[PDB]
Amino acid sequence: TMAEKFRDEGRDVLLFVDNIYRYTLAGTEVSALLGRMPSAVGYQPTLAEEMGVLQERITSTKTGSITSVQAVYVPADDLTDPSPATTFAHLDATVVLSRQIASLGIYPAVDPLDSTSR
Amino acid sequence: EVQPGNVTVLADTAIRGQDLDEARAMEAKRKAEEHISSSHGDVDYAQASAELAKAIAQLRVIELTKKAM
């Protein structure tokens, strides 16, 4: 919301989100208590909609632009877990870090065979 | 060579002359020049190597066990 305001004021903004995975982990923690049948790996049934309804409003527009960098934790280093898998579609440039490189002392540990950009 | 106490015959394996060794030398000049290479006769190593190449193909083990390398 604070970002959208500066955007609509005509300005251009930088939005850094430190870990967007926690936004869906907090949804998963609460889902079962809200009485909703679990889904693929225990995730809330509304995972993709909860994630889209946020990431669709963090965008640039004709009246201003938001430039955003988002860290995305992948659990158990499984790049196919539903939460990263459903997040991949919402980003223009995706940089994929890996433990097998960081264990070589090669920092930054970007994996050049998985990073891409529109 | 019959030395004082020991006579030794240094036989050779094949007939030798000049009409022949020159034929062999021309053939070798010819093989190198034509870029002709023959196969070895090791029908065992060939089968071993082929089974080893086929077993190791598309194995992708290192992408799967996270060996850092």
UniProtKB/TrEMBL annotation, chain B:
<comment type="function">
    <text>Produces ATP from ADP in the presence of a proton gradient across the membrane.</text>
</comment>
<comment type="subunit">
    <text>F-type ATPases have 2 components, CF(1) - the catalytic core - and CF(0) - the membrane proton channel. CF(1) has five subunits: alpha(3), beta(3), gamma(1), delta(1), epsilon(1). CF(0) has three main subunits: a, b and c.</text>
</comment>
<feature type="domain" description="ATP synthase epsilon subunit C-terminal">
    <location>
        <begin position="19"/>
        <end position="63"/>
    </location>
</feature>
<comment type="similarity">
    <text>Belongs to the ATPase epsilon chain family.</text>
</comment>
<protein>
    <recommendedName>
        <fullName>ATP synthase epsilon chain</fullName>
    </recommendedName>
</protein>
